[PDB]
């Protein structure tokens, strides 16, 4: 009767509601995964930037030491050759 | 009826809640692995820094001995 027809219209509205809800929730979830993927890419990029900076800093530190040692050995060998009395 | 329809809404809302939660647990683990890999590489470079400092200090001591010998030689 009139209550069955009212409930049938409510049932129809519910079916349409679940369709829209699922579709829209899927769109929100996709944008959520898209944000998490970008956050993870940023994290790796920052850590690789820090690693490259420290790597280049260590190369400079090694080079400066190698230079000072090379000049010290050259000056010591020059001195030795100059101290030969005979 | 009306209560079953409300329950259907809640089941879908609970589904997405759990789906987002499991997705978040995978991202948290990928970030964890990422942090461990780069922490490992950082430790190695911090030991390189201390070895370089130690080498610099050793070369400075050799230079002192050499200069003191040059002054004491002539
Ligand atoms: Na973002
Ligand atoms: Na001579
Ligand atoms: Na699902
Ligand atoms: Na260090």
Curated annotation (Swiss-Prot), chain B:
Free-text tissue specificity from the UniProt record: Testis-specific (at protein level).
Protein location: Cytoplasm; Cytoplasm, Cytoskeleton; Cell projection, Axon; Cell projection, Dendrite
Ranges for region Required for interaction with SEPTIN4. Required for migration of cortical neurons during corticogenesis: 29-74
Subunit structure: Septins polymerize into heterooligomeric protein complexes that form filaments, and can associate with cellular membranes, actin filaments and microtubules. GTPase activity is required for filament formation. Interacts with ACTN4. Interacts with SEPTIN9. Interacts (via C-terminus) with SEPTIN4.
Function recorded in the entry: Filament-forming cytoskeletal GTPase. Involved in the migration of cortical neurons and the formation of neuron leading processes during embryonic development. Plays a role in sperm head formation during spermiogenesis, potentially via facilitating localization of ACTN4 to cell filaments.
Stated family: Belongs to the TRAFAC class TrmE-Era-EngA-EngB-Septin-like GTPase superfamily. Septin GTPase family.
Name of this chain's protein: Septin-14
UniProt organism field: Homo sapiens
Parent-protein residues present: 346 to 414 of 432
């Amino acid at each position: 009767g009139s209550h069955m027809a009212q409930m049938e219209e409510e049932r129809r509205e519910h079916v349409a509601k679940m369709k829209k809800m699922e579709m829209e929730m899927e769109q929100v979830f996709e944008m959520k995964v898209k944000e998490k993927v970008q956050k993870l890419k940023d994290s790796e990029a920052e850590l690789q930037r820090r690693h490259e900076q420290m790597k280049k800093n260590l190369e400079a530190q090694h080079k400066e030491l190698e230079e000072k040692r090379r000049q010290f050995e050259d000056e010591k060998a020059n001195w030795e050759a100059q101290q030969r009395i005979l | 009826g009306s209560h079953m329809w409300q329950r259907e809404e809640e089941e879908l809302k609970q589904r997405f809640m759990q789906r987002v939660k499991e997705k978040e647990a995978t991202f948290k683990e990928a970030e964890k692995e990422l942090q461990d890999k780069f922490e490992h590489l950082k430790m190695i470079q911090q030991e390189e820094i201390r070895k370089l400092e130690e080498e610099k200090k050793q070369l400075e001591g050799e230079i002192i001995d050499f200069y003191k010998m040059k002054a004491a030689s002539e």
